[PDB]
Amino acid sequence: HGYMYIPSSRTRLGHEAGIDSCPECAILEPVSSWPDLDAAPVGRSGPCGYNARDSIDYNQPTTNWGSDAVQSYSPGEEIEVQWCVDHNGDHGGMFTYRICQDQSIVDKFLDPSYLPTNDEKQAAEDCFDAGLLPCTDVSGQECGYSADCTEGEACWRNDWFTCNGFEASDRPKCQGVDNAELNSCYTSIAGGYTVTKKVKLPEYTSNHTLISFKWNSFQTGQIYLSCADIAIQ
């Protein structure tokens, strides 16, 4: 149970505007989230998430999200990206961040009076996959392999980030990555823990595009998706 926190995703904004009582509850499930990290099609969830809890589809703006870039960055900028895992829903596994470089696709997600179809959701997803922001693009960032994976497997990759071992001696699962304190970010269920990394933005530009957060669960057949409205200028 988790969601994108920095820069503020639509889900965070959703919660913060009082619309979404369980931001961490937005789940793609059931799916094969492991070990093949993109076998699973995003269906209704899309690259921005659908929260069944409160029936929110974050793939289109409302008055409460998606109207504006929440943050403006520069081409090639290395930036903080953070997500929030719930104390009772730390599934371990692997996560990534992506920018889709086809403004025409993304535009379908920036109009409050249109909801992307599942078809457009999946096509967006493919675009986001092509625009995955690799761990290893940030100089100085250590990009480990998953302890829940073995060499040569489809999960064996360090473009994505990994949580710690689900049954590791020390600092297990996603919580273990920052080893942050409880409520270091908001979750509704049992209090949130931050999971913090850096990504390097592309030299691709836009006055208004999306980061899509995607977290593939190891413990469960589940994926958590969020997106943030951002500008590269």
Q: Strand, helix or coil at 97?
A: strand
Q: Peptide bond before 30: cis, by omega within 30 degrees of 0? A: yes
205 lies in the site for ligand NAG, by CB under 6 A: yes
Among 32, 117, 179, 207, binds ligand NAG (CB under 6 A): 207
On whether 1 is known to bind a ligand per the annotation, the reply is yes
- Give the position of tokens 């836009």: 206
Task: Considering only CA atoms, give the Rg of the chain.
Answer: 16
92 binds, among Cu ion, ligand NAG, Zn ion, none (CB under 5 to 8 A by kind): none
129 lies in the site for Zn ion, by CB under 5 A: yes
- Nearest residue (CB) to Cu ion, 6 versus 26: 26
Q: How far apart are CA 35 and CA 216, in angstroms?
A: 9
159 lies in the site for Zn ion, by CB under 5 A: no
Number of residues engaging Zn ion in binding (CB under 5 A): 10
233 binds, among Zn ion, Cu ion, ligand NAG, none (CB under 5 to 8 A by kind): ligand NAG
- Nearest residue (CB) to ligand NAG, 29 versus 102: 102
Contact 11, 83 (CB under 8 A): no
Task: Select from 12, 9, 198, 195 the least CA-distant residue to 89.
Answer: 195
- Nearest residue (CB) to ligand NAG, 175 versus 209: 209
On whether 186 is known to bind a ligand per the annotation, the reply is no
In sequence order, which residues have a C-beta less than 8 Å from that of residue 119 and are 6 or more positions away?
A: none
- Nearest residue (CB) to ligand NAG, 136 versus 233: 233
In sequence order, which residues have a C-beta less than 8 Å from that of residue 154 and are 6 or more positions away?
A: 35, 36, 37, 39
Q: How far apart are CA 22 and CA 34, in angstroms?
A: 24
| Both tokens assigned to 63 | 């008055």
- Nearest residue (CB) to Zn ion, 166 versus 193: 193
Q: How many CB atoms lie within 10 A of CB 60?
A: 19
| Residues near Cu ion (CB under 5 A) | 1, 89
Q: Which residue is nearest to Cu ion, using beta carbons? A: 89
CB of 153 to Cu ion, least distance (A): 23
Q: Which residues pair with 215 in a beta bridge?
A: 95, 224
On whether 91 is known to bind a ligand per the annotation, the reply is yes
111 lies in the site for Zn ion, by CB under 5 A: no
Among 21, 117, 179, 233, binds ligand NAG (CB under 6 A): 233
Binding residues for Zn ion, per CB under 5 A?
36, 38-39, 81-83, 125, 129, 195, 197
Positions that interact with ligand NAG (CB under 6 A): 205, 207, 233
